[PDB]
Design a binder for this molecule. Structure first.
Ligand SMILES: Nc1ncnc2c1ncn2[C@@H]1O[C@H](COP(O)(O)=S)[C@@H](O)[C@H]1O
Ligand SMILES: Nc1ncnc2c1ncn2[C@@H]1O[C@H](COP(O)(O)=S)[C@@H](O)[C@H]1O
Ligand SMILES: [Mg+2]
Ligand SMILES: [Mg+2]
Lengths: 247, 247
């Protein structure tokens, strides 16, 4: 139903305006990357290890908001086939502060590795071209751990460690950018993970804001991503906590 | 038109889900307050001055999301008269990390002053009662600079300084929580302010995320807040930056 597709995508509009237009969003990005530099400079690693920073790409270092805008204008639910075309379009932007932080790490005895769910086989060329264009240093192919067979990221983190790196901090917009312990879990478990790691945020786990999509969306209801459009609308509305209007 | 009211409020749904349900939102709140403590501990003031922290309340220390939920469920655009009832309902929650930070400052040779656009004359009693209940220390009436005749906050900051305080950092979810220089301005000017102060974020200007309302909403279009519902819908949709779907 076109009506349902429209309602689902209209629900993203205000958060998209915030991400695309607000100074507040930029300020949060700068806050994150300012904190990240402090953490990187403070970090010490075990003898014999090289210093690594793990960074997510989508909505962490790369800004894909025009794809979300296209979804709104065309009443299009997320589809990986459209995403691949977006990546190939080579119109990604940089999240504020990301290039400077990336290049600083890479010139100060660290290496940023991009652990990203852009697809290795179909989305790599556009990703690398955009990052070169946007000014990122250190974007040789071996810096990337793009998605092959699994969206969960912990195994890729382990690959980096096997290459003699100690990961000093992680940057992301999704809790699944910090490990696998709440991957595929609902939001109660995800909030619990955050509470259990309260002191790490802004230190070793650096957060960027994303009000548009992520593991928190699937976290709204059991089986969310397999529901039809009407089901996803209902899951979102049922998750709302509302004042009853009384004293 | 009820139809227009519904569309306007439906546009807030996904960002509301993110703020209310996601672990990611909590992580951003903890990140902000963790950074704020570091900044407070580092701060030194001029000889003879007392250390002050200025904090916003709404969507910075207090969580009003159930009011937004009520707007969604009842297709209600923002109305100050409903807001006053919400405040009187005494159902505000605390933003994660806020109480701990507040109480830490107040027990470590600082004082938090609440510079807030809750109304001094009609919204003070509920605010103070909720803050006591939520565990905030230092909520005697004189700690509050609630709204009297002006929403812009700089004059209240100056009042605090006149009382012999040096403000070591500001906490807020709206750029207008940091001064008046982009008060009432559109988002291009607001983004420019942020760029001009890039290094202050996470240091002396501490940001909390708010994808639901604020100066950035008015910043979407000249005269936004005076437009009717249809006009505000159009302003939001016209602000969207969309991929054209081509390579
Ligand atoms: N609106 C969306 N809903 C669900 N998935 C999305 C959406 N937008 C992009 N994606 C997919 O999620 C991936 C995010 O990768 P990540 O590494 O930031 S977890 C993208 O590369 C894309 O594959
Ligand atoms: N959805 C909204 N749109 C516009 N104004 C709002 C909305 N929700 C609350 N407000 C008003 O804005 C004030 C915010 O105060 P502040 O100090 O965080 S700038 C609230 O006390 C209330 O007076
Ligand atoms: Mg991401
Ligand atoms: Mg506020």
């Amino acid at each position: 139903e076109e009506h349902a597709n429209m309602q689902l995508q209209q629900q993203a509009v205000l958060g998209l305006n915030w991400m695309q237009d607000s100074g507040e969003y930029k300020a949060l990005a700068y806050q994150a990357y300012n904190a990240a530099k402090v953490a990187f400079d403070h970090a010490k690693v075990a003898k014999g290890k090289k210093k690594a920073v793990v960074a997510d790409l989508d909505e962490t270092m790369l800004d894909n908001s025009p794809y979300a805008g296209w979804q709104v204008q065309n009443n299009k639910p997320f589809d990986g086939k459209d995403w691949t075309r977006w990546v190939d379009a080579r119109q990604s932007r940089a999240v504020p502060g990301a290039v400077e932080f990336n290049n600083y790490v890479n010139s100060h005895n660290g290496k940023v590795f991009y652990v990203t769910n852009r697809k290795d086989s179909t989305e790599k060329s556009g990703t690398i071209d955009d990052m070169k264009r946007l000014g990122f240093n250190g974007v040789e192919e071996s810096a990337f751990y793009l998605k092959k067979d699994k969206s969960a990221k912990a195994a890729r983190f382990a690959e980096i460690e096997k290459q003699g790196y100690e990961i000093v901090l992680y940057v992301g917009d999704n809790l699944d950018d910090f490990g696998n312990t709440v991957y595929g879990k609902l939001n109660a478990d995800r909030r619990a993970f955050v509470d259990q790691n309260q002191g790490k945020f802004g230190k070793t786990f650096i957060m960027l804001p994303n009000a548009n999509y992520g593991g928190w969306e699937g976290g709204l209801a059991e089986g969310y991503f397999k529901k039809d459009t009407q089901g996803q609308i209902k899951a979102r509305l049922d998750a709302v906590q509302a004042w009853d209007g009384k004293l």
